[PDB]
Amino acid sequence: RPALYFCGSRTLYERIVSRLRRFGTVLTGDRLIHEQDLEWLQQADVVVAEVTQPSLGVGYELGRAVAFNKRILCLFRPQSGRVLSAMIRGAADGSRFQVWDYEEGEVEALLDRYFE
Amino acid sequence: RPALYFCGSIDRTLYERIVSRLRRFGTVLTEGDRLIHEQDLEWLQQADVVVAEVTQPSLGVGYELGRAVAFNKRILCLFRPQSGRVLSAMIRGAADGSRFQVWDYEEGEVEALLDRYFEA
Ligand SMILES: Cn1nc(-c2cc3ccc(C#N)cc3[nH]2)nc1NC1CCN(C(=O)c2cccc(Nc3ncccn3)c2)CC1
Question: Which residues are modified to Phosphoserine (chain A)?
Answer without folding.
Answer: 9, 55, 80, 85, 95
